[PDB]
Each structure stands twice: as C-alpha cells, then as structure tokens.
Symmetry: C2
Subunit: 186 residues, 2 copies
C-alpha cells in the first residue's frame, strides 16, 4: 500500500521512466505518473510518447508519497531543475523524511533545488561534473547508491537495479526478490 | 538508414517495447511504433500508456522494414497472435528474408502465424510450453537466441541484450558497442 510519484517531463529518458514504473507496479506499489507540464502526452528523449496518469498539480493534492522518483534524460532533468513545483515537492518530501530516488541526470535536479546536500550520490558518468559543482555531495561509482533517504543510480542500464532498490526500501527484500525472479535479469 | 517496425498491442510489456525502441533509435535506426488497433494510445500490461507513431495499417504502407519487432506481455502477444494483419506482415517479412525479432511471450505469435518453424528459439520460461506445442521449434535457454532471421529473447531483464542484438544484426558490432557504452550496463 506504498505510493510512488514519478515526475515526467519533456525529454525524460523513457527507459528510466518506464522501468521503475513497471517494476514498482509489479511490487504492488501504487504509482502515479505525473506530467510536469500538465495532463498532456510527454515526448521523451528518444521520442517515445507517454500519457501521464495525472498532471503534477493534481498528483500533488493526492500526496504525500512514500517515494518521489526523478527519471533522467538531460533535457528532462533540466526541466525538473527549472520547476518551482518540483522544488516544493522535493523540499516537502525531504522535510517529512520521505525517500527521494533519482537516476542518470535526474540527481542534478536535487542539486538545483538544494536537496540532500552532504549525501553520497551517483549519477550518469557524463553528469558527474554538473552534480559535483560546489562539492555539495560526495560522489560514488556504485551502480545504485543509497545514503539514507537519498537514492541515486547511473543510467538506463542500472534502471532495474534502481527500481528494485526502491522496492526493497518500501516493501522489503523478500518482495524485491519475488518481483525480480520473473524479470529474467542476469 | 535501417528501418524497424515495432508492433504495439494492448497488454504489451512496456519495458520490452520501450527498451528496444529507445536503443534502436540510439543506433540511428528509423523506428516506427505501430498501433495494432489504430492510432490511439495503447494501455500496456503495467498500465503505462504509449502513443504510437502510426497505426499498423498506415505503417505497413511505408515498409518493408529491416526488422519487425514483437514485444511480449501475455495479453499483448495474444493480441498479436489473433491479428490477421500481423499474420500478413510476418509472412511477407519471412518471404523477403527479413529479420523478425520477438521477446518474452512475443515469440508465441510466431507459432500462431506459423513463422520460422524449425528454428531454435527462446521465450520467457513461463511461455515455453505454449511455444513448444507441436514441437515446431527447438527450445533454447540462451538469454538471446538468433537462428538466422529469427531472433528471440526471454524477458524484461534481457531487453537490453535483445535490443543490442538487433542493432548488431542491422548496423554491425561496432555500432552496437558504441551504443552500449553510454547505457551503463553491467
């Protein structure tokens, strides 16, 4: 009965959006895919078009959520970083001691909104310098990094690991293992 | 300048749809996401809603394609299996000696349409018995199986491998390696 908010902006990495949504739903998490710009379909980085479940404005009224998830994609992460609405959502989640999960370029939105300073984080290798501007975080090359309530990961190829880490954090290791087996992961 | 047709039906596994589309586009392949039922948005197995690029009817007029891709998801694969339009597309592709790629439950649509009999194939473990009804194929537990122009794979967790195998088949090993590195695969 845990709840996840996935914030979907134009230019989001569609694999990094869909893998966590799908895996979290397999884990019995109630996931809301919320469109940053509104209710309209979102054109992702490789032109996959995804229809959000709700606008972010409407989804926020239905919170709070057990996790807020930020997909990557450079242009998607920049749109998340420039959003006052995302700022408020992340600050409130941080304030209530709720989990925040971000992947690839996604964690650079944490920097933009001054979230989780002092945490160990990872990002896509190409996003490291952006994330580390100012030295506000300590960098990690782990495929998934979790420092308390800040959970980060590196890229499309770590999305399953990222998603299962979220499942483990919310629903426990046993559920994560049960969800993992039918995926045919290596 | 290679071209891929991805046939998207209600109940398709969204990870198995999006990963190949995204990875193939990273490889410079022109991908058409074609809606089986028409141009309308498609509700995937875990409720991700994807807007196709075109209807299958319209996409067929723009062929032929260097690969026809069948995602899995049990209900999606069943819809592919029951479609006369898919039958014609697969038979024509087989007739012109073009590549057909299917993942998870996806290969059971090959059985339904009598495509590639005598090939070595793999499927999701839970789809093995369906696929092997009649003994028309030889079963494999390889994560990706390629027997000439029939390329198969096992599940969401083999989707990157499946996608990169398609890229290698169309654009060569060097391009596949170049596309792979920024994904941060294990």
């Amino acid at each position: 009965s845990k709840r996840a908010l996935v914030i979907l902006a134009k230019g989001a990495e569609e694999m990094e959006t869909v893998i966590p949504v799908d895996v979290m739903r397999r884990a019995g998490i109630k996931v809301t895919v919320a469109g940053l710009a509104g209710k309209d379909p979102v054109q992702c980085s490789r032109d996959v078009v995804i229809c959000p479940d709700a606008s972010l404005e409407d989804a926020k009224k239905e919170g709070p959520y057990d996790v807020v998830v930020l997909p990557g994609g450079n242009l998607g992460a920049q749109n998340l970083s420039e959003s006052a609405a995302v700022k408020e959502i992340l600050k409130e989640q941080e304030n209530r001691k709720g989990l925040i999960a971000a992947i690839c370029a996604g964690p650079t939105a944490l920097l933009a909104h001054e979230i989780g300073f002092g945490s160990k984080v990872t990002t896509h290798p190409l996003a490291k310098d952006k994330m580390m501007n100012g030295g506000h975080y300590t960098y990690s090359e782990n495929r998934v990094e979790k420092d308390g309530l800040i959970l980060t990961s590196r890229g499309p190829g770590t999305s399953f690991e990222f998603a299962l880490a979220i499942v483990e954090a919310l629903n426990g290791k046993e559920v994560a293992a049960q969800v993992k087996a039918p995926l045919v992961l290596k």
